[PDB]
Each structure stands twice: as structure tokens, then as C-alpha cells.
Curated annotation (Swiss-Prot), chain A:
Catalyzes the attachment of L-aspartate to tRNA(Asp) in a two-step reaction: L-aspartate is first activated by ATP to form Asp-AMP and then transferred to the acceptor end of tRNA(Asp). Pfam families: GAD, tRNA-synt_2, tRNA_anti-codon. Belongs to the class-II aminoacyl-tRNA synthetase family. Type 1 subfamily. It is an enzyme of class 6 (ligase). ATP binds at residues 223-225, 232, 476, 528-531. This is Aspartate--tRNA(Asp) ligase. Its main location: cytoplasm.
From Swiss-Prot, chain B:
This is Aspartate--tRNA(Asp) ligase. Homodimer. InterPro entries: Aa-tRNA-synt_II, aa-tRNA-synth_II, aa-tRNA-synth_II/BPL/LPL, Asp-tRNA-ligase_1, Asp-tRNA-ligase_1_N, Asp/Asn-tRNA-synth_IIb, AspRS_core, GAD-like_sf. One of its GO terms (biological process) is aspartyl-tRNA aminoacylation. GO terms for molecular function: aspartate-tRNA ligase activity; ATP binding; nucleic acid binding. ATP binds at residues 224-226, 233, 472, 524-527. GO terms for cellular component: cytoplasm. L-aspartate binds at residues 178, 224, 438, 479. It comes from the Bacteria. The lineage of its organism: Bacteria, Thermotogati, Deinococcota, Deinococci, Thermales.
């Protein structure tokens, strides 16, 4: 068997007196009165080795430097004084033998602090990526990757128990989730390409046409986007699909799955069921379709209070939303929130102060005439600051919701734990304020609400979709919908989305043909697994939970990708780079 | 909750008297005696629905057609006589309600017969792939896909219990001009730059050992743009794993126990442990192949040193004479077929003779009588057998008679059953300049290190192949962890410093920061599943594979893109 008798970090006082064989890295060396103390490290943590001048191990111990790899043999003994910061801190290994398995030069940044329970100083992330195989030696990074393992295994255990079949779907496939495709040139016929899948969407629906009833996959997705907002060129989804389901069936299975994952991998109990908010409810109350429920400060509609007001900017607005903050803001901070508001298309931010009887600052003058109704509507107390955005309903909600989020940081609100929620009853179409156009919030295979089918031709903007988003702590961690299984309806919805019969055949003809062979009712969802793991670990970026990620420009400092290829190779593909 | 109360195929006599709600596809319809029989299908199998004339569902049941999707409601009853070919065969459902959820076109081929336990006529595979979502309705295809699920879950269970960490590695990585051709991905923001899809996770998994994770695995997709002949797909799946502080023995032992766990859990088959082991040299000598089929015997025997004084010059002067004893007197037709198999494998010919009770007859029988007692003790041949001989260079004679041995198995109608695994070990590190076999990180055998510069062709590697029924299903090695030894192997290969950096620079630098001893392996998961299912191609164990030519008839890929999509990438077709 193995030479190793134990993981180094697993030794305890119950092993005192045993002879052990250990293998690991030298976390740190210190010399004292002729003794050589080596902190030996493996994935279970540190244990102290002691090399005595009279031991045969001593000559070898004198050569050793940090990050060298050694095999050590000796007797577990109690330390005269224990180190309470270490799990092995009561014991040490009295070395009888020591062998160097590998030498090492000094690393470009330290990896030893976290194994001692000490705080790690911030290193340059471009350097950590360039030497990612050293960065991954740190305890925090190994914890992240081992949590990732435990989450996926929990997912397999639960979905296997629920009868889901794991199916691996293609990577070299047909050239659809609202991004650009990554292409792969076909070598034998220049001008031909594969595309990497933006998601397995069409394949998992075909697996329902095939009668497998329920599917899942830990799927890699590839999307060529502006990597703004911590995007990686490829990323991981828990993808799943079910047959003969309504929305509620998908929502309940996912809730139970999430509670299982959090229980088994984090030791956290998630109360069930998750809260549910409709799209309109979410934006009315929070000004966001990804509400952060870790704090209050809900938005209130006060437009109907100003229909007789001399303040034309309020009186003409479709909506005036208000938010009461429990603090008297400085003029600098107010201007900061005003800038946030203006960055979200608002015409501006109004403000005032609540005092014992009257109001002070900003627009207080125009607030005095409606004081009684306003205080009942906002629940504001003396010392608060009231903020207002006036305008069209979606802008006013969205602008003051972003002010709300920013203000939680300014006020230092303690936001704790994991607050999941479903957002449901999305409209089928979203209005692009900029491009003056209708676009789909979810992909084109999302089923409209069956009660709304006659509105597809009469009034498309009132049409509800059978779609849903899963939100965690103000972050979208999942999204899905019930699908269209009638080929007539899917073409009808394609026509509505501005897709003629020619484009339908060229992009989706194979899938529309599949719908004519008896497609069952089906629906599904996909989680953003990297996003979820980042939240579960409190990481600032999904790069902390991916073993070998790209940097922010989608480049790989570790390997040098992306890079040129030999001119010979590029000519074999029958392509050339166009001259600027 | 769900509308259905049960999977259609899960109903048994224990459900008699319950009212059920079922959803599925119409497998077939038959009218007999005024009753309408509908075989309702879902993934657990078929159940008979019966519509009686008085029933509200009677008119609906008469109009439904194959592959329509329906919801049925009724009472579970015993059949008057059971159909034992169905798991639900003791029961049927008396319909009270029947609702059509989707109509269906007549499929281009039948998918109904397997679910009744009947043989299925072979359909054009190109037609099956074009309508793959329909092909996957067949019972056979769903069993393959569900077996694949059970194998992967069993791998996760076992390796998780043994302390392995699953780690996902990059799909967009560095293109290298190293050997097999990469599939490329253009980098939009800087035309002329490309990512490559990974040929394997090799460098990432070794770096994970340098990172101290101790033991890793991944169900990994590999992409290799090479010749697709011999049932290859442009991408395929490996079970990929790596371990620290191991010797060859530690890797083989782990993989043996893992494989036995997989077969027990996913197939209900017991694999005796340990697996047999043969060195590469023993495998070549006894079977003429580095992937021996152990499902039958008929071992090759070296008889060269028997004819060093025989008059038969072609035997007497050959470097090697290999012999094989077949337990059947063959026809002159059969011998000439084996002879052509030998010549097709670079042999000069195939000598033969029959073994009689007192001596030999036919072919080269005359030159065999002087050495009869020794020839028979070496071949263990009995009267009635037929001796085949190939004389020539050692590797050629072995390889040719090994292929003769395989073709002979079919001629004799040998029963080849079950699952026969073995390890092939102690491969040579190199082969003639000099070149490595798989990748250049494989460790030399420690006791052969001084021969690296003196006698390189005799240096053994710490490399191993896993073979099942004559097929390579896995390969790996102990890796080099000493950078000075890795540079030493590169100097032996003539691979300069500028070429090392351009091809492995980031990994060779990683070795300078303390790499532990480590080693690993990868299984060909598709290949293993095809063997586990008796499928003739890995296409049968992949949900949506390419055809034999590498194209996808289902979606039409690879396909052109609009010129604007390609111009945005800064590339053009020449
Ligand atoms: N660049 C990114 C993008 C996304 N994601 C995460 O993928 C989820 C689903 O993606 S999705 O595009 O919203 N819809 C789909 O892919 C559907 N096919 C799923 C279905 O309808 O069943 C999002 O909710 C994010 O959490 C992430 O992490 N990084
Ligand atoms: N076109 C194919 C090719 C292969 N394979 C299967 O991958 C195994 C390993 O691949 S390998 O190429 O022999 N080496 C490696 O990839 C090393 N990184 C493994 C290691 O050293 O740990 C083969 O033994 C086949 O069973 C398959 O299925 N289809």
C-alpha cells in the first residue's frame, strides 16, 4: 500500500506514541538551539516535525527550505507547550528519518499563512493567475474547490434519488441565449464551423421528446459576451429538464434540491418554501427583478398624492416612488445617491429631512402640504431622509431601487445569511428603453401563459410567460420556464419575435420538426453554479471558485492563451486574418 | 403535485384496485372483440389500457394513433391471462378517461418493438442520427443512456469515498503545435489569436498535484481533430484521475477496485480481483498484441530454437518462429484465409501442418518430424490439431500470428463471453531518432535510469494500459516530478530549450516549485460503455454523437455562418 500512514494535518493527541510516515510540503522552517522545526503541510493541514542533532534525520533536515516536498518518519509526542491555533497543535513528530522528494525555489507570493490560521495579505490577482498552481496551495482556495466538489456530489445524490438521468450533450454543435457564439472551424471544408453551446437548451428539450422524462447535467456553457460584470467566457450550469410539469412542480423540486445542497455541503438549513414574488411585485416593492431581501427599505408609490401639487415634475410623472432611510444624510452622500439615480436613467433625486414636527432640506417645502398622508405611506420617523424619483413606472422603480442598494452600503447595514426567492410571472416581452423595441426576457422556447394566447396577436405586451428566476441575495442564480411543445404555437411565437419562416428553418428547423412527433409538456431550469458557489463562500468573484479561470479580459496568464498559431496551421483551415 | 400517480411501466399486481393517472406515448393500438387496446409507454415500460364500449374514453381511444402523447385515467385490473414479456404483464388499466396532449406524425422508423420485448429491425444509422430524438425513444437506447448514468454515479460514489476531489479544468486553453491537431476557437477581440479545446486534462491534473490536492478526478471531455476512422468521435469522454505519493501498484490497485465497484453497481457483474498483469514483452510473446483478448486461449509459442539444425532454411535462419495449435483440422480454404491475414500483417507467409496420432501431415510436415517430441511438448498439441507457423523478425512474427490467432477464433466458433480485464505494464519508454509513446512526462523505471543514455531502447517506463476483451480502455503512468530528470529526458529526445518553453514552459516552471511524486490514468468512458453493452460502436452509448464522418445529421453542423458573423471575428475564407 501507500508509505503514508496518515495525512499530516490529521494527527491528534490520540496518536501519541505511534510511529507514523508522513508526506507533504514544508510550510515553514525554524531553527532553535540546534533543533530544526519543520511545519509539514498537506491538504488536511499542518503538523510540527522535530529534527534533533542526534537523529539520522538531521543531516537531511538541514538542507530543507520552504515548499520542499519530504517524506518523514517518527514518533508522535506531545509538545511541551501546545499551539492552540492548530488542529494538530498538541502534538509533534520526533523525526527518526527524513527524505527529500523534491526541492523548490521561493514562491512569488506566500501560501503558508492560511494553514496557520493567520490572515493572508492580498496578492495581485494577475500574479495569482499566472502561478495558479501555487495560488491553489492556499487553504482558502482548496476549501473553495472542495466545497465545489461537495455541492456537485450532493446534486448527483439528490437528483439520482429523484429519478433524473444525467445525459452529456454535445460541445461541437449547431451555430442561443442572448450572446455571440464561439466558433470552431471545420478543417475539411473551409467556410464550415461548429459552434460551442451557449447552453444545452435544445438538446434537453429533445431528451423530453425522446421520453427520458427527467434529465440533468453539470453543463459547460460558452458565451462570447462583453465580459463586463465578472463574466467568464465559459461557465458552469446545473441544467435540468422535466416532463409533464407545471411551474409549481419545477419550483418545488428545485427548492428541495437547494435545501439539500446547503444542508449537506454548508451545514445550513434553508427554510422552505422560498418566498415568491411576481415580476411586477418585485419591481414595485424593490425596483429590481433580483431583489435583495437581506434588508428592508421597500419602495412606496406616492404618485397619487401629487395630482393637485404645484410641483410639475411630480405632478406630470406616471409614478413617483419614495424610500425612507433611517439616517440624516450629509449633502455629499445625497449627491452620491443622486448620481447613482441619474446613472439609472432617472431625471434626478429629491431629498428632505424628517424632524419632530416639520421637514427640512431639499424639497421639504413641497412635502409640507401632504405631510399626514406621506408619513402614513412611508412610516418615516424623525431623523430620516426621504428620497424620490419621478417618472415612468419602470424607470422610477429601477432608479430608486439602485439608490436603495447603494444606500445599504453607505449606511453599513448588516446583511447576513442566504435569502432565496423566486421571481415568477415574467412578461413574455421586455421593453428596451434605448433601442425602442420589444425583446424577449427569456429565450424563444418559453411558453406564453395559455390564458394569454389570443393576446399574442391582439396585445403582445400584456402576454405573461411561464418563466421564473431564482434569486439569492440580490443575484440571479437560476432561470427557467415551461416550454412550448406545440409546433404551431412555437412558430407563432417565432413570428411574434420577428423571425420569419426562412430564419426558423435555418436556425431551428430540426427542433421544430421534432415538435411534430409527439412532444410532451415539459419545463426546466438552469443554475449558475459558479455564481452560487461564489455566494456560498462569500467570494467577490467567480474566479475564486474556478480552478483555472480566465482574467477579466478572458485571457489565461498561466498558459498564454489565447495566442497565435503557426501560419501553416491557419492555412490548413482555409482561413486568413483580414488586413486592417 | 404531479398529475400522474405512477410511471406507466411501474404498475404491477400490487396496484390492482387503485385508480391511477398515467401520461405517456401510444406505443400501438389494436381493436379486438369490440375492445380497444392501447399500449401506453413511458421510460419504465409499457402498460395495457383497455377502452370498453360504454366508457367515456371509447371514441377518443379509437382516434388515437402511434406516438401520440396522452393522459389516461382508469382502474388497475388483473388481465385474464398475463403477458410475461411485459413487467406490467399481469395487469391492465380499464379506461375511464383519455385525453390527447399532442398528436404525432408517423415516425420514419419504428420505436415500439423493443418495449414489447421483440427484436428490432436494423435501421439506417444515418436515418437514426437525423431523427436521434426519435431513435432515443427505443428501449435499447434508453438502457444504454441510463447505464451510463449509473456508471458515472458509481464512479463519483467510490472516488468520493476514497478521498478524491472532482475538479473541472479549462475548455478554452493554449494551442500547442504538439502532435495531434487542436480544434481552434477564434478570439474575437484580437483577430489572429485562438484558444484551443483540450486534448486531455493532463497538464492541469498534474498541476493539481503540484497544488497539493493529493487526488483528483474528472469526467472529462477531450477534443482531438484527427482521423475519425476506427470508430472515433471528434470529442469523447474520459474518466481522468491523478494521485500523489503513489507507485504503479497504488494506481493499479485503486483502479481495479473502482472498476469492480462500477461493474457490481451498474451491471450486477462480479469481477474477480486482482486483474491479471502482463508486461508488454510477455503480452507480445504470448498473444502478439499489447491488447490481448483473454476470452480464449490459443497462446503463441516461440519455437525458433527448435529448428536451428533443421534443413528447412526459412525456419532455421529466422530470428523468431512463432507457432500456434488450433483444436480443429482446418480446410485448405481456412488455412489460406489465415495465411492472407498473416501476410496482411507484414509476414512473409504462414506455414502449416496437421497433427496426426503418430506424426504430422501436410504443409511443412516433413521438416517437423525430426523435432516431433520437442515440438509437441512446446505446443502441447494433440492429434487432430493444426499447427500454424510464422517465421521472421520477432515483432513481425508475433504481431502477425497474433492477428492470425484472432481471426482463427472466429473460424473455430469459439464462445467468447464475459469481461476479461488485464493490465499491460512495463512498456518501453521510447521507440526509434528517439520518440516517446504517449506524452513526455512519463517516468522511466528507476532501476533503468542509467540506461537512459547508454541503451535507451531498453529503458522501461512506469506506464500501464488497461485492456478489456482485446480493447484498450485506459492508459496512464507515473509522472516525472524531478525537473532535472525531465530535462534529462528532453536532452535524450533532442528537444531543445526553446521548444520546451514554447510547448510546456508554464508546466516545466511549475516543477521548479516542488512537485510531489504523482501518477494517474484515464479511461475511455465511451469505449468502456460500448463494451459493457455489447454495442458495435461508441455511437450507441452517446446521446447525440456525430456520424462516422464527423458531421451531425441531426442539426446539420458543421454549417456556414453569415459573412457578418465571421467578419466580426476578423477572419475570412481564403
Ligand atoms: N454568463 C452567465 C450567464 C448565465 N449564468 C447563470 O445561468 C442561469 C441560466 O442562464 S440563462 O441564460 O438565464 N438561461 C438558460 O441558459 C436556459 N437555457 C435555462 C432554462 O431555461 O432552463 C442564470 O440564471 C445565471 O445564474 C451565469 O452564471 N453566467
Ligand atoms: N480517441 C480516443 C483516444 C483515447 N481514448 C481513451 O483514453 C485513454 C487514455 O488516452 S491516451 O491518449 O492514451 N492518454 C491520455 O489521454 C493521458 N492524458 C492519460 C494519462 O496519462 O493519465 C485510452 O486508453 C483510451 O481508452 C478514447 O476513448 N478515444
Amino acid at each position: 500500500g501507500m508509505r503514508r500512514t496518515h495525512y499530516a494535518g490529521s494527527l491528534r493527541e490520540t496518536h501519541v506514541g505511534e510511529e507514523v510516515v508522513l508526506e507533504g510540503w514544508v510550510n515553514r522552517r525554524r531553527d532553535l538551539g540546534g533543533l530544526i522545526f519543520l511545519d509539514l503541510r498537506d491538504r488536511e493541514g499542518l503538523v510540527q516535525l522535530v529534527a534533533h542533532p542526534a537523529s539520522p534525520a538531521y543531516a537531511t533536515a538541514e538542507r530543507v527550505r520552504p515548499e520542499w516536498v519530504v517524506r518523514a518518519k517518527g514518533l508522535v509526542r506531545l509538545r511541551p507547550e501546545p499551539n492552540p491555533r492548530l488542529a494538530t497543535g498538541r502534538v509533534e513528530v520526533e523525526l527518526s528519518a527524513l527524505e527529500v522528494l523534491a526541492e523548490a525555489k521561493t514562491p512569488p507570493f506566500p501560501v503558508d499563512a492560511g494553514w496557520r490560521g493567520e490572515e493572508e495579505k492580498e496578492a495581485s490577482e494577475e500574479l495569482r493567475l499566472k502561478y495558479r498552481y501555487l495560488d491553489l496551495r492556499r487553504r482558502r482556495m482548496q476549501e473553495n474547490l472542495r466545497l465545489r466538489h461537495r455541492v456537485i456530489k450532493a446534486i448527483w445524490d439528490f437528483l439520482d434519488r429523484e429519478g433524473f438521468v444525467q445525459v452529456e450533450t454535445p460541445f461541437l454543435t449547431k451555430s442561443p441565449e442572448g450572446a455571440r457564439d464561439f466558433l470552431v472551424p471545420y478543417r475539411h471544408e473551409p467556410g464550415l464551423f461548429y459552434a460551442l453551446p451557449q447552453s444545452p437548451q435544445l438538446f434537453k428539450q429533445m431528451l423530453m421528446v425522446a421520453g427520458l422524462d427527467r434529465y440533468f447535467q453539470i453543463a459547460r456553457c460558452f458565451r462570447d459576451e462583453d465580459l463586463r460584470a465578472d463574466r467568464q467566457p465559459d461557465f458552469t450550469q446545473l441544467d435540468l429538464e422535466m416532463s409533464f410539469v407545471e411551474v409549481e412542480d419545477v419550483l418545488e423540486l428545485n427548492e428541495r434540491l437547494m435545501a439539500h445542497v446547503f444542508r449537506e455541503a454548508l451545514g445550513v438549513e434553508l427554510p422552505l418554501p422560498f418566498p415568491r414574488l411576481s415580476y411586477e411585485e418585485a419591481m414595485e416593492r424593490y425596483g429590481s427583478d433580483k431583489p435583495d431581501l437581506r434588508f428592508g427599505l421597500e419602495l412606496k408609490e406616492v404618485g397619487p398624492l401629487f395630482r393637485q401639487s404645484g410641483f410639475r415634475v411630480f405632478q406630470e410623472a406616471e409614478s413617483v416612488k419614495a424610500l425612507a432611510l433611517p439616517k440624516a444624510l450629509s449633502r455629499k452622500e445625497v449627491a452620491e445617491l443622486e448620481e447613482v439615480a441619474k446613472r439609472h436613467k432617472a431625471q434626478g433625486l429629491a431629498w428632505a429631512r424628517v424632524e419632530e414636527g416639520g421637514f427640512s432640506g431639499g424639497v421639504a417645502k413641497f412635502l409640507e402640504p401632504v405631510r399626514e398622508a406621506l408619513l402614513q405611506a412611508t412610516e418615516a420617523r424623525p431623523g430620516d431622509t426621504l428620497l424620490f424619483v419621478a417618472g415612468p413606472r419602470k424607470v422610477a422603480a429601477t432608479a430608486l431601487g439602485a439608490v436603495r442598494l447603494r444606500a445599504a452600503d453607505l449606511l453599513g447595514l448588516k446583511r447576513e445569511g442566504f435569502r432565496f426567492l423566486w421571481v415568477v410571472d415574467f412578461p413574455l416581452l421586455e421593453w428596451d428603453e434605448e433601442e425602442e423595441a420589444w425583446t424577449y426576457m427569456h429565450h424563444p422556447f418559453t411558453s406564453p401563459h395559455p390564458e394569454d394566447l389570443p393576446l399574442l396577436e391582439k396585445d403582445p405586451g400584456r402576454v405573461r410567460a411561464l418563466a421564473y428566476d431564482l434569486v439569492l441575495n440580490g443575484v440571479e442564480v437560476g432561470g427557467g420556464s415551461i416550454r412550448i411543445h406545440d409546433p404551431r404555437l412555437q412558430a407563432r411565437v417565432f413570428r411574434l419575435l420577428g423571425i420569419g419562416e426562412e430564419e426558423q428553418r435555418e436556425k431551428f428547423g430540426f427542433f421544430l420538426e421534432a415538435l411534430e412527433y409527439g412532444a410532451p409538456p415539459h419545463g426546466g431550469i438552469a443554475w449558475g453554479l459558479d455564481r452560487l458557489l461564489a455566494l456560498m463562500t462569500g467570494s467577490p468573484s467567480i474566479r475564486e471558485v474556478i480552478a483555472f479561470p480566465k482574467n477579466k479580459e478572458g485571457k489565461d496568464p498561466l498558459t498564454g492563451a489565447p495566442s497565435p498559431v503557426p501560419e501553416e496551421q491557419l492555412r490548413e483551415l482555409g482561413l486568413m486574418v483580414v488586413r486592417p
